[PDB]
Amino acid sequence: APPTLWSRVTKFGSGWGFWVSPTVFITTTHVIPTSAKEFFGEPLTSIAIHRAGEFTLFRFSKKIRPDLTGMILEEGCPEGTVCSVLIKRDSGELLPLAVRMGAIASMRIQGRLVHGQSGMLLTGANAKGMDLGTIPGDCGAPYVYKRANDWVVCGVHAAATKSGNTVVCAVQ
């Protein structure tokens, strides 16, 4: 995946977030540090928060990341699209896990109720464990794909089943 897309992936709370533009940051609601009153030097006062379940979008009143260009954010992707989940792991290793995307789903995973776009990992027979599949620390990592000549972001990592095969992308 292009270096600009990896540059946008930021360590945040108990997981990750993603800079869509110089002023727009998306992440998975449950990774947000619950007591936090200040983000990237800005008070809440200066920030527009849009929260729908496990998807959260922060819009800032000034350019936090002026090095970036604004890219396309869509509400999930057509069934059958292959995405990459842009996962950073211990030591500057970059793990773009391939997922075939499915339907909008409601699920119960480790007891909690989860809603978003379901997918099946294309990394192995099952994706149990950190080598072929996701771990709780990956939450907030972006789901991206290339369409003709540009790249689209269409959600953030919210959950994965015990077997690991099934993942859920929270969507705008």
Ligand SMILES: O=C(O)c1csc(-c2ccc(C(F)(F)F)cc2)n1
């Ligand atoms: O809508 C919600 O608040 C929601 C849906 S699932 C969820 C969630 C998942 C995992 C965890 C973790 F602590 F285990 F990481 C904590 C909350 N929150």
